[PDB]
Design a protein around this ligand. Structure first.
Ligand SMILES: O=C(CO)[C@H](O)[C@H](O)COP(=O)(O)O
Ligand SMILES: O=C(CO)[C@H](O)[C@H](O)COP(=O)(O)O
Lengths: 216, 216
């Protein structure tokens, strides 16, 4: 089972604390949502410490559709409305229009270029004109309340940054097996051991936020 | 130089003919745009013969942002308007809203799921309701006239299918080096030898279409 498989990463509180410390150290984490939801594990990195090598790993090992999780306030500052008015995706994934840094990039898709765009968008002083649309980074609007309002990786990403005392922006991408199928828990666990990345779940975060009374 | 490097794939007419034959055989090709444009090589596959293994290779080896090149007529049939009204991307890349098959998929990102979405969208009998929006496949509207009107990989993709007598839909994705930088011509050539994929350029296609008087 999953509870049993994740036991070696510690108990739920420990899994959360280890993930937060990894982010504070500039390392990535692996976040699983509910088994009855997507049942997928995303690599998560903080934007603050994001490097080209970390983006290259996401591209190499994940779906390649690398998303930028923002607060509603930051997406509003950037003038990024939802990509679609009537979202009928299964989870109502909150894609805004896609973005490219207006300056400092070329075609936008290289690992370096994606980082430039992400840092440009996540800048607390950013303005809409700093970003061209469309582009090759995919922002996502986290719901107010985080994982206590919506049990998505989007909310998990922003909550992890806030809980770790980091600027409230992170990137995510779904871990993919070489044959193109999506990684499930055993493969996620093995990837996290290989890359020294903590694994935790949305359920871990929810019970952690409830018990420590963690508004954000 | 590039002319010299591609000489081993044949002369320009031969490079085009070999690419067309590969597509007819269900194989992929590598298309380079102008050195002074993106200077990137895209893997191209025909939708008609697209397999999970081909999609997995694109995800593994390319940017992961896999695009579906459609005619204007097919995008209109699907009710896919441009993603952004005032496109200010550098090349005015003609992204529509992103799409997911409404049925037959789960999270949409697995290689199989992307193929299901692509085949669903490319179906000559498709209807808008067959696709959820947003999603994890990125359609692109090819300009009328193809590479004789716009020298993009988008037009190259649809033109190649039409020139090969295939249904006029193809997928593309930018070849990426493991370190996250974008592949340039020497790496593209080496990838095409490794994977038995012909390499050709947009310039090859333009002069080919002009000289053989090829409306499409
Ligand atoms: O679609 C996705 C990104 O492209 C993934 O599902 C991502 O994990 C965000 O979605 P959510 O917040 O719904 O879990
Ligand atoms: O952005 C892209 C896809 O995401 C690439 O540039 C793609 O090759 C299509 O663009 P174009 O037709 O302008 O060459």
């Amino acid at each position: 089972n999953q509870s049993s498989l994740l036991a070696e990463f510690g108990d739920p509180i420990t899994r959360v604390e280890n993930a937060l410390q990894a982010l504070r150290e500039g390392r990535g984490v692996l976040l699983l949502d509910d088994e009855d939801r997507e049942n997928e594990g995303d690599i998560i990195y903080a934007v603050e410490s994001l490097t080209t090598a970390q983006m290259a790993l996401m591209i190499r090992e994940c779906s390649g559709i690398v998303c930028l999780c923002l607060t509603e306030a930051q997406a509003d500052r950037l003038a990024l409305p939802p990509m679609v008015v009537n979202n009928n995706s299964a989870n109502q994934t909150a894609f805004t229009v896609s973005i490219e840094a207006k300056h400092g990039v070329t075609t936008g898709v290289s690992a370096q270029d994606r980082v430039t765009t992400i840092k440009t968008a996540a800048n607390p002083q950013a303005k809409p004109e700093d970003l061209a649309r469309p582009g090759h980074v995919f922002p996502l609007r986290a719901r107010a309340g985080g994982v206590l309002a919506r049990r998505g990786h989007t909310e998990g990403t922003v909550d992890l940054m806030q809980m770790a005392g980091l600027q409230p922006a992170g990137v995510l991408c779904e871990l993919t097996n070489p044959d193109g199928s999506m990684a499930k828990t055993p493969e996620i666990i093995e990837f996290g051991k290989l890359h020294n990345m903590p694994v935790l779940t949305i359920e871990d975060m929810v019970q952690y936020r409830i018990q420590f009374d963690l508004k954000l």
